[PDB]
């Protein structure tokens, strides 16, 4: 029926007063970060040159306290620099890299893919977004004239859609990178709609209206103290350019303002917001009749986009093959059509941690529960535990062999491991005479531990592989010790784990 009450755990904290405005400034892009400004002011460079510019930035902050550091590290360090807040009138911490005293944090951090390759990270304090959206900006006269010609939300939206180096590649591919430190203010969903047969645009626009309806129902369910009238609440839709000529997939991006007075905090919280918005439109009748005959699968929303360091291609940008351009689905009772059209061009409407657009109270949905085990999975798990048996966790099984210390148990069985290496791989057996076990992966079902003494591939004869001992619980609650090797040569999937032998302990 829409699911939300029975499969989500709303955890909010109300903050009224100065802590509301203070919290907002601390967790949202600065008021001028996404306010169109004449030119860019930021730090745009390839990953290599940014490691250097970050190293040199640390040498002007380490003197005054900054803990010293000893493409994931670069993104983490840039996000931490962008998140750091201004202490009074003193220039912010990122001012060392951006080299201006007018910089105001927090700030957006983007990733630019260049040709032939090269992830160029770019942290900006302001940018020429007026120029980027200028191509899809329709003048008030044009929208008003179209409204007079077609007095009908759907028809006008179909008509209004028809009328539409790292520093230079910033303007061809910019991908916003999720910052877990900041608070998310817009529900940005990446709809990857697979297509059996091509879908006409008239169909997609009617499907998108149904999606708006379902998503607004889901939003009024998730945020119960808000007021989402599902005929006036603005949802923004953006289609990837290919009449739709698309054959394989339709690229869609749906942006929703988080209704006041709510602000959503947490990657997992938006993972829920996205999974509640998915079921709503799947249970919706009109949407699955409108797009069903054309869609191969009903998996539309990708929920992994929301993780610190994961980027999402912004609208009004291409991919290095399709510039995301708005598709206008006017609200059925929208009282300002020209405003709605000239609302898709404002970067705040499509930024994860944008400034929220006199706050008395503010409710932060910071938890919608943990990983969603399907009522089907939860009921599947409780029913499997009652028919087949209990599979004890890794920690409990290891506890039997006096391990509360994994790197020491590994040493005792390392002899068995090296003996099987001598028996089946004797040409590389002696490299495994003096080895130190350093933890690699630590889970509740998997424990990978390396053996650095560049060792040799035991499968082919390509100094090419890294060895990893992996402990899991198999069979009748017995400990299975697997030697695994990750090589680099293409014959062996580039830097991919491959097992070679698995013995008991």
């Amino acid at each position: 029926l829409n699911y939300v009450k029975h499969n989500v755990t709303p955890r909010e904290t109300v903050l009224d007063g100065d802590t509301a405005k203070a919290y907002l400034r601390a967790r949202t892009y600065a008021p001028g970060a996404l306010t169109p400004a004449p030119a860019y002011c930021g730090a745009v460079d390839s990953a290599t040159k940014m490691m250097g510019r970050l190293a040199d930035a640390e040498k002007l902050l380490v003197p005054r306290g900054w803990p010293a550091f000893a493409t994931c590290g670069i993104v983490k360090r840039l996000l931490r620099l962008a998140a750091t807040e201004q202490q009074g009138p003193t220039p912010p911490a990122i001012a060392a890299l951006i080299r201006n005293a007018a910089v105001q944090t927090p700030l957006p951090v983007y990733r630019i893919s260049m040709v032939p390759t090269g992830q160029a990270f770019a942290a900006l304090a302001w940018d020429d977004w007026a120029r980027i959206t200028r191509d899809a900006r329709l003048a008030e006269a044009v929208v008003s004239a179209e409204a007079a010609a077609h007095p009908d939300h759907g028809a006008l939206g179909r008509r209004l859609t028809d009328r539409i180096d790292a520093g230079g590649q910033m303007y061809v591919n910019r991908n916003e990178i999720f910052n877990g430190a900041l608070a998310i203010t817009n529900i940005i969903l990446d709809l990857d709609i697979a297509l059996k047969e091509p879908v006409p645009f008239r169909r997609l626009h009617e499907a998108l209206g149904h999606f708006r309806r379902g998503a607004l129902a889901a939003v009024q369910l998730l945020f119960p103290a808000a007021r989402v009238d599902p005929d006036a609440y603005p949802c923004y839709f953006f289609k990837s350019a290919c009449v739709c000529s698309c054959t394989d997939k339709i690229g869609l991006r749906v942006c929703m303002p988080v209704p006041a007075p709510y602000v959503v905090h947490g990657s997992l919280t938006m993972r829920g917001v996205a999974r509640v918005i998915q079921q709503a439109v799947l249970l919706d009748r009109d949407f699955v009749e409108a797009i069903g005959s054309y869609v191969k699968n009903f998996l539309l929303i990708d929920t992994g986009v929301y993780a610190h360091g994961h980027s999402l291609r912004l609208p009004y940008f291409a991919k290095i093959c399709g510039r995301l351009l708005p598709v206008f689905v006017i609200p059925p009772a929208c009282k300002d059509v020209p405003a709605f059209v000239a609302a898709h061009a404002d970067p705040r409407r499509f930024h994860f941690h944008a400034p929220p657009t006199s706050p008395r109270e503010i409710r932060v949905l910071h938890s919608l529960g943990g990983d969603y085990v399907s009522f089907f999975e939860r009921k599947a798990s409780r029913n499997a535990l009652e028919h087949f048996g209990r599979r004890e966790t890794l920690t409990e099984v290891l506890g039997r062999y006096n391990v509360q210390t994994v790197e020491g148990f590994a040493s005792e069985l390392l002899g068995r491991i090296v003996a099987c290496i001598e028996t089946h791989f004797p040409e590389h057996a002696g490299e495994y005479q003096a080895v130190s076990v350093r933890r690699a992966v630590s889970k509740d079902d998997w424990v990978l531990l390396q053996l650095v003494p560049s060792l040799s591939c035991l499968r082919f004869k390509h100094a090419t592989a890294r060895t990893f001992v992996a402990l899991s619980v198999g069979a009748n609650n017995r400990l299975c010790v697997s030697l695994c090797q990750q090589c680099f040569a293409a014959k062996c999937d580039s830097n991919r784990l491959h097992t070679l032998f698995t013995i008991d302990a």
């Binding site: 802590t19 919290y23 306290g65 803990p67 931490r80 911490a93 610190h308």
Partner: protein
Amino acid sequence: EVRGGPVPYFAVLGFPGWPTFTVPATAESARDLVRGAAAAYAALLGAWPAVGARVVLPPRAWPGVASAAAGCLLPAVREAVARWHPATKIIQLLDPPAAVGPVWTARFCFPGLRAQLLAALADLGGSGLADPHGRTGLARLDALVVAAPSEPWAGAVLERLVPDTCNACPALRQLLGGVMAAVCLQIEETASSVKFAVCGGDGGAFWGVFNVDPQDADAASGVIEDARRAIETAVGAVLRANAVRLRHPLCLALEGVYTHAVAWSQAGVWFWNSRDNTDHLGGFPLRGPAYTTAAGVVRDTLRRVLGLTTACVPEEDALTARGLMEDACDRLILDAFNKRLDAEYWSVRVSPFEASDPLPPTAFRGGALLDAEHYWRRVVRVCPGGGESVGVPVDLYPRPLVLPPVDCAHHLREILREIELVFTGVLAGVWGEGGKFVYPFDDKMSFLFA
């Protein structure tokens, strides 16, 4: 010295021959501390605080004086000294999970009892000294004790000369704590006669209650004063009988009258006089600038929670108390956000004895700032990058500081642990036990910082 020291000083043992007194900060009363330093110089011949405990007696003549003082005492205290084990407290007190009220409570203290007792025992062992002229160092201690109430400069000297002397001669501790044990015994004996009831304390300082009707105050002053008179006179009589004579006549201080009193640990006690709303909290560690705000929050929450004496079933009061305690925690963590960028405020003073965070290789570059670190290391735990929490020695970097956001998800957890001991103690002490007040910081209000 490697491990440093409590009191700043700069000795002039040779060239140029001019004493130089370091007077730390204290701008408002700069003349007062200058006069205190001058008096400390003049009295103890300038040896203090450089020479140490040797101003009084050689560190090795003490083993003789302590033995010579264990003989001139009374037969009972002679054994009482020999049976002293660290923290024995052989006196009827309250169970540490307990609380009292509304009954007329009162705190008492003997100003400078360890120093005065040390002086009397030093005189008892004075005959045992090799040189009668070698007792001049035993005249400076009496000058300190005599002038202690008159001038506070002798005070800070005596609060450090005495504990350090007790470290110079380990055998003096078992003597001083046996004499104080005897004092506490007569305190308890005399207490019953004047309706006083020993409920807690640490020797020289002791707090108790009165078996008077808990509504009359005109006669309350009379009993509270007669108890002071009788206890002071009886303790003085025991000391005289123990041959130990004090230079400054003994005096008991009425350090406050209160109606409610709640204790959780051995040192943690909160007193509150409802009539005048005067309170006193002890046992809460002031390990930084945030702990003071936490203490204020606790002393307001306790003032509001013992104001719930409205007639109710005990079960109801437990819940309407826990709710208010959780609300106080909420208002504390909300205000914590508005000072998340004040690293100096979220700072902890680590001692050179406690386990300490490892020094970053860039704190060794403070120039003329590394010299200020003598006793305390002020550390703030910041969270660079992600996952890792690293310590920054605050006072070894130039100001204004630039830092990654302060890991309030570590300091607030520690402050909340202390506030939780105080609140588990009060919840399980006034109303029915069985409730460990825990605030779900990790779920309710963790998002603000992490």
